[PDB]
Write a protein that binds this ligand. Structure first.
Ligand code: SAH
Length: 245
């Protein structure tokens, strides 16, 4: 991910979502206090972390593997006048810097796939307080059968993808009460994820026009939009909310 990550740090969001989606996910947890501790795993540049900060109270800690994203994250916190309660730090998903039952809420949008839905659910449970909440958005299937094309894509990119029922089953096994789930509206993909990339598509085309690897990356981005604008009825992002029992 050489220039791949330098490309995404130019976007407000590195994955599908929306202020409304983050807000809807919050409507399912309990109200927190300024002393509550929250963690946004795979926060990226923190686009959704700031939406979250607007809907909940407490000290938020953003964690991401790419340091360049954290730099932007902390820069945005300052600009947003909330760097005192919202801080970003580089870290790994399979080695979180928290103590047992330290957090009131675990947040993660389009990032848990990096360690697997099931694995994440179980391993992150340790860091959550009794009665605490977890909210993550994951790519899932909306039906039991779908076209081969979309399927081959996901079984290659993210083999752990599954139907909603299976995702909820794993939450229970992980010791979470399946509080709620909802499919993110399409605008979370087009308006907040794809559209933003088209804007910088021309400046990008002019700078990397003569570079194979770069241009290939472009075909990929375009192929994603095609898959979505043709299979949106068979898959998408889903928000899962659970409370640790
Ligand atoms: N092992 C790991 N530990 C922590 N973060 C990781 C990771 N592997 C990948 N990531 C981060 O997971 C994020 C997935 S993209 C989603 C970014 C942001 N949550 C958004 O919704 O806009 C990226 O920022 C990627 O850098």
């Amino acid at each position: 991910f050489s220039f791949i990550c330098n490309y995404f740090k130019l976007l407000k969001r590195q994955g599908p979502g929306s202020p409304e989606a983050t807000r809807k996910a919050v409507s399912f947890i309990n109200e927190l206090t300024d002393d509550a501790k929250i963690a946004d795993i795979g926060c990226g540049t923190g686009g959704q972390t700031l939406f979250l900060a607007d809907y909940v109270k407490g000290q938020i800690t953003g964690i991401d593997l790419f340091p360049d994203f954290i730099e932007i994250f902390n820069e945005n916190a300052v600009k947003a006048n909330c760097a005192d309660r919202v801080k970003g730090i580089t870290g790994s998903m399979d080695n979180l810097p928290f103590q047992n039952e330290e957090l009131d809420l675990i947040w993660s949008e389009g990032a848990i796939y990096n360690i697997g839905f099931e694995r994440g659910m179980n391993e992150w449970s340790k860091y959550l307080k009794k009665g605490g909440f977890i909210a993550v958005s994951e790519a899932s299937w909306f039906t039991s059968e779908r076209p081969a094309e979309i399927e081959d894509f996901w079984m290659d990119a993210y083999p752990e993808i599954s139907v909603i029922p299976t995702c909820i089953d794993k939450m229970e096994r992980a010791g979470y009460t399946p509080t709620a789930h909802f499919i993110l509206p399409e605008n979370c993909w087009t308006e907040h994820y794809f559209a933003p990339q088209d804007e910088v598509r021309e400046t990008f085309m002019k700078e990397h026009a003569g570079n194979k690897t770069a241009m290939d990356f472009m075909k990929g981005q375009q192929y994603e939009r095609s898959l979505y604008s043709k299979y949106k009825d068979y898959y998408g992002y889903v928000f899962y909310i659970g409370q640790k029992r």
